[PDB]
Amino acid sequence: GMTEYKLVVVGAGGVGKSALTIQLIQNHFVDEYDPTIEDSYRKQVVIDGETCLLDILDTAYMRTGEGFLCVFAINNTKSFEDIHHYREQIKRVKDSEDVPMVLVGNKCDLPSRTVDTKQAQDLARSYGIPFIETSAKTRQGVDDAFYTLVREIRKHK
Numbered sequence: 001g002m003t004e005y006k007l008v009v010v011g012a013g014g015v016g017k018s019a020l021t022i023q024l025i026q027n028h029f030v031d032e033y034d035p036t037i038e039d040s041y042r043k044q045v046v047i048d049g050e051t052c053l054l055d056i057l058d059t060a061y062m063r064t065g066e067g068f069l070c071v072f073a074i075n076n077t078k079s080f081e082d083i084h085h086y087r088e089q090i091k092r093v094k095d096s097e098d099v100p101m102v103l104v105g106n107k108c109d110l111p112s113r114t115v116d117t118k119q120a121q122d123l124a125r126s127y128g129i130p131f132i133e134t135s136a137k138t139r140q141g142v143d144d145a146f147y148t149l150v151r152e153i154r155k156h157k
Ligand SMILES: Nc1nc2c(ncn2[C@@H]2O[C@H](COP(=O)(O)OP(=O)(O)O)[C@@H](O)[C@H]2O)c(=O)[nH]1
Pocket: 011, 012, 013, 014, 015, 016, 017, 018, 019, 020, 030, 031, 032, 033, 034, 035, 106, 107, 108, 109, 110, 134, 135, 136, 137, 138
């Protein structure tokens, strides 16, 4: 059969969890999206030549997660400061120190960057995970983030 990957998008309010998901799925940038709406979105894609099904859960099911995107916004220091909370949450619900994960720095199209690449890279390295810069507005890195996570899930086992 065709492979299915259950992915989960986590992070502080306003970082672009919904916008990133809707970019991946509907291929357009949502300028506003109810912050309390939590829902799952499905899409068939090809990644590195392999066809598969994605099941993205956009948080505002959690235990069934095979891979997690931890999102902060590069113009939102508070959202970056909060990442550890989500990291630790995931390790608790999965009851494991080994969970496929990607750190995502979103809104890289904006000029008022307060979290530099160095900081993000160092944080990611301390977790042993990749760091991907993204923009839900421009589509920069959007595929890369979600695909990298699938490659991490494939690399997981
Ligand atoms: N400029 C810019 N704005 C973004 C980006 N991603 C999300 N936003 C905006 O940030 C706000 C909150 O985004 P949203 O997806 O609802 O964040 P969420 O609470 O994490 O789900 C909205 O006004 C979005 O249009 C981005 O990459 N660039």
